[PDB]
Design a protein that fits this description.
The structure is cut from a larger assembly and holds four copies of chain A. Chain A is α+β, with helices and mostly antiparallel strands. Chain A is 44% helix and 21% strand. In chain A, strands 3-6-7 form a three-stranded antiparallel sheet, with no helix packed on it. In chain A, strands 1-2 form a two-stranded antiparallel sheet. Chain A is rod-shaped. The structure holds a molecule of 2 linked components (NAG-NAG) (3 copies) and 2-acetamido-2-deoxy-beta-D-glucopyranose (2 copies). One 2-acetamido-2-deoxy-beta-D-glucopyranose binds next to loops of chain C. Chain D: This is Spike protein S2.
Chain lengths: 195, 48, 182, 320
């Protein structure tokens, strides 16, 4: 089962193209921000032209100054905006990285009992894989299957004394009573060693 | 058509599946009206 | 009627209607919380008229991938189904008027008026979110709008003396992706 | 709340000259719209992550016999059309022309993707799953088990043997019922309970009000009304007034967008914490100290609130 499950992962990744969208979004956002910054250099901002060289090659300094300060203010505002967005994005990326480090420490270096923290199901182990600007975890979990129907009782009365299971639960198929572990069906005779 | 407006907004010739905000609509005015006081006496600028 | 107006130089645009404002005899025009002209008094007949801007709103386009098809659906946000533009005769600034804009499949939702999609009584997983629990999808050669389904119905056979215990098990492997750096 | 702002309408409105001058100012409006749309999408992402933890809709059996445990106050009420538990609508009543003006100035509010009824349905499904099957439904198929046996399991979870519960079942059920009853009175008597939920609404409304109020500033111009400027000056001198009006309004919009981005980041952190708490306290039993209430954790029940969620933590406390 382990080998088949590990084999299916490669096919699942290969078939689905949008598997790494979480990693692609960061690249797309950064590229779009840089593209906007580059494109913003073509704005007049109320000046005669967006080129400094032709302004300096066409007008005297006393009015070239009043032509140039507008461009300076616009470009400085653009830089300020870009830096602010970069700071916010970096903060959220740092939060994600802290989560990834915690997941590594608690799922790969040990076995975790927190529900849904390391995969879906009962956690067994995890394996890390490296991706561009990110990490990938392969969580191995235990999933029960093929449940059945039984009648249960809280305690068993015998010789005027109540008996309770030590680490199991009392079940019966309809006529005979047993004690079994809770996560797997393994009936056993009720003795004084398991109660 | 709205699809071409979407393409203009996205600055691309291909559009992925989704919902996109293109522009806003409003009802254009039909005519114009003027409301002024009913007085008609002319101001005495000739005197001044 | 959506017309321009000029009240002693108070230029603007909007619709003039009757007003119930208890204007005092010496008062000329009122204002709103946003400090803009809301009501005006006619200079000739001394009548108080309300001022309301002409109807407007945002427009969103619903479409599948261009690689898939070419049909689209248009949603007019926060616009009543009646007041949607029916005539394009120089009364709207968006030339992308619908091929009929009426008589066609027209659905009215809490998010606005949806034109170009056919309502159905079924329920599937959400594909393209519209809003207020309404989703849209491209099915077959057409675009449909429906109500999203939360999940499959289930009912555990609860009893006070019955229990269920697994007999087999499955080993499962799943993946998780986390950005680490930029 | 998800808000959308019409950049051109807010700055200029109906004036084509103002739009023409705004054109040479770069693609600032597109940036603003993109940021606002990102925030709006993130809101629905947060809600879906918090509440869509289960893929099935479990239901409670008609016969409400759970060995003395009552659960009437948190289960859905069929009589009410909203189909909400008494605690749920009690919470919904605690949290409470301006909208028309904001709409007329180009500011709109988008509706959430998930309606309140859908969220209530999700919470009801979680309640039914955690009542009829314990923690099994959160890790695979849902396996039924009598509720007192599940309580014995959870007592074993904290280091107390089963016989204690089986011998004090009646007292434990009475204590649970009394505590659940007192929760409703505690909520009803004190109107300051939902302060965390009220603060977000207050902050958003006040920021929007400040944005609206900024429209009546001259910023050095002769007037703060666009039509008055246009209807009184010829173009080449009207331009120098329109420009400063535009700069002031652009600054106001930029400040508002930055504050909204920071607030959205904080809200996202809170939503992540809420999702983790749901997964670890509702779908299982937690051993982390003080993560789910104060004491020894036994179980938790979620309740939907406007723009939020409320957890009821059941804990074991020693005495005498
Ligand atoms: C329930 O469990 C009991 C456990 O004893 C089963 O009884 C055994 O059944 C097999 C098959 O017929 C016999 O060979 C054994 O001799 C039985 N055991 C005893 C002690 O008599 C029983 O069959 C199971 N199923 C039911 C009762 O439906
Ligand atoms: C538990 O599950 C395993 C695998 O899911 C079952 O093994 C299968 O048994 C059938 C019947 O002989 C075979 O045709 C399959 O090839 C088996 N699968 C594998 C992977 O070996 C098993 O029968 C189930 N029940 C048990 C073990 O009681
Ligand atoms: C326990 O459940 C029972 C029903 O199974 C509740 O009984 C009635 O509940 C309504 C709901 O408000 C009350 O108005 C009635 O007065 C209750 N009946 C009686 C005879 O008092 C009962 O309220 C639930 N327990 C609690 C603490 O609410
Ligand atoms: C157990 O019995 C109940 C009662 O008929 C039934 O509804 C349920 O499907 C059964 N479960 C299994 C796994 O057979
Ligand atoms: C606006 O739509 C509602 C339905 O939501 C309808 O009842 C009402 O009649 C419509 N308004 C007009 C003027 O027709």
């Amino acid at each position: 089962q382990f080998n088949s499950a590990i084999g299916k992962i490669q096919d699942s990744l290969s078939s689905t193209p949008s598997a790494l969208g979480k990693l692609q979004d960061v690249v797309n956002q950064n590229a779009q921000a840089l593209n906007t910054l580059v494109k913003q250099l073509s704005s007049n901002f109320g000046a005669i032209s967006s080129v400094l060289n032709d302004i300096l090659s066409r007008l005297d300094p006393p009015e070239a100054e009043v032509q140039i300060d507008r461009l300076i203010t616009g470009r400085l505002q653009s830089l300020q905006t870009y830096v602010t967005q970069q700071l916010i994005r970096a903060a959220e990326i740092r939060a994600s990285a802290n989560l990834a480090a915690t997941k590594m420490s608690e799922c790969v270096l040990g076995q975790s009992k927190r529900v849904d923290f390391c995969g879906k199901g009962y956690h067994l182990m995890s394996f890390p894989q490296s991706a561009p600007h990110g990490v990938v975890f392969l969580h191995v979990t235990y999933v029960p299957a093929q449940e059945k129907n039984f009648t249960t009782a809280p305690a068993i009365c015998h010789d005027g004394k109540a008996h309770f299971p030590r680490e199991g639960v009392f079940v019966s198929n309809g006529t005979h009573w047993f004690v079994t572990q809770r996560n797997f069906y393994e009936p056993q005779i009720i003795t004084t060693d398991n109660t | 058509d709205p699809l071409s407006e979407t393409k203009c907004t996205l600055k691309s010739f291909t559009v992925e599946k989704g919902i996109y905000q293109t522009s806003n609509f409003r009802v254009q005015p039909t005519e114009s009206i003027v409301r002024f006081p009913n007085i008609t006496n002319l101001c005495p600028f000739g005197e001044v | 009627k959506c017309v321009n107006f000029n009240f002693n130089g108070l230029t603007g645009t909007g619709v003039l209607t009757e007003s119930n404002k208890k204007f005092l005899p010496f008062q000329q025009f009122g204002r709103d919380i946003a400090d803009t002209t809301d009501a005006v008094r006619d200079p000739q007949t001394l009548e108080i008229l309300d001022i309301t801007p002409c109807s407007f709103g945002g427009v969103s386009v619903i479409t599948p991938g261009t690689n898939t098809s070419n049909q689209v659906a248009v949603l007019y946000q926060d616009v009543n189904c009646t007041e949607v533009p029916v005539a394009i005769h120089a009364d709207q600034l968006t030339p992308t008027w619908r091929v009929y804009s009426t008589g066609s499949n027209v659905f009215q939702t809490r998010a606005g008026c949806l034109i170009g999609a056919e309502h159905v009584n079924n329920s599937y997983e959400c594909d393209i979110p519209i809003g207020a629990g309404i989703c849209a999808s491209y099915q077959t050669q057409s675009i449909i709008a429906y109500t999203m389904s939360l999940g499959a119905e289930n009912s555990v056979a609860y009893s006070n003396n019955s229990i269920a215990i697994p007999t087999n098990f499955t080993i499962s492997v799943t993946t998780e992706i986390l950005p680490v750096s930029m | 709340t998800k808000t959308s702002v019409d950049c051109t309408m807010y700055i200029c409105g109906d004036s084509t000259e103002c739009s023409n001058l705004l054109l040479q100012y770069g693609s600032f409006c597109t940036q603003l719209n993109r940021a606002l749309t990102g925030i709006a999408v993130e809101q629905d992402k947060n809600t879906q992550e918090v509440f869509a933890q289960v893929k099935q809709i479990y239901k409670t059996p008609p016969i409400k016999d759970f060995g003395g445990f009552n659960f009437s106050q948190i289960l859905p009420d069929p009589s009410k059309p909203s189909k909400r538990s008494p605690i749920e609508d009690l919470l919904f009543n605690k949290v409470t022309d301006l909208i028309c003006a904001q709409k007329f100035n180009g500011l709109t509010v988008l509706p959430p993707l998930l309606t309140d009824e859908m969220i209530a349905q999700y919470t009801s499904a979680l309640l039914a799953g955690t009542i009829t099957s314990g923690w099994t439904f959160g890790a695979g198929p849902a396996l039924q088990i009598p509720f007192p046996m599940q309580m014995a399991y959870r007592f074993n979870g904290i280091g107390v043997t089963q016989n204690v519960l089986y011998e004090n079942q009646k007292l434990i059920a009475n204590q649970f019922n009394s505590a659940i009853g007192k929760i409703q009175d505690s909520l009803s008597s004190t109107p300051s309970a939902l302060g965390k939920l009220q603060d977000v609404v207050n902050q958003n409304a006040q920021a929007l009000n400040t944005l609206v109020k900024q429209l009546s500033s001259n910023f050095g111009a002769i007037s703060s009304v666009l039509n008055d400027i246009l209807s009184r000056l010829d173009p080449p001198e009207a331009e120098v007034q329109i420009d400063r009006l535009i700069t002031g309004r652009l600054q106001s919009l930029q400040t508002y967008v930055t504050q909204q981005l920071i607030r959205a980041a904080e809200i996202r952190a809170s939503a992540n914490l809420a999702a983790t708490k749901m997964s670890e306290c509702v779908l299982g039993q937690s051993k982390r100290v003080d993560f789910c209430g104060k004491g020894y954790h036994l179980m938790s029940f979620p309740q939907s609130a406007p723009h939020g969620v409320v957890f009821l933590h059941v804990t074991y406390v020693p005495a005498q």
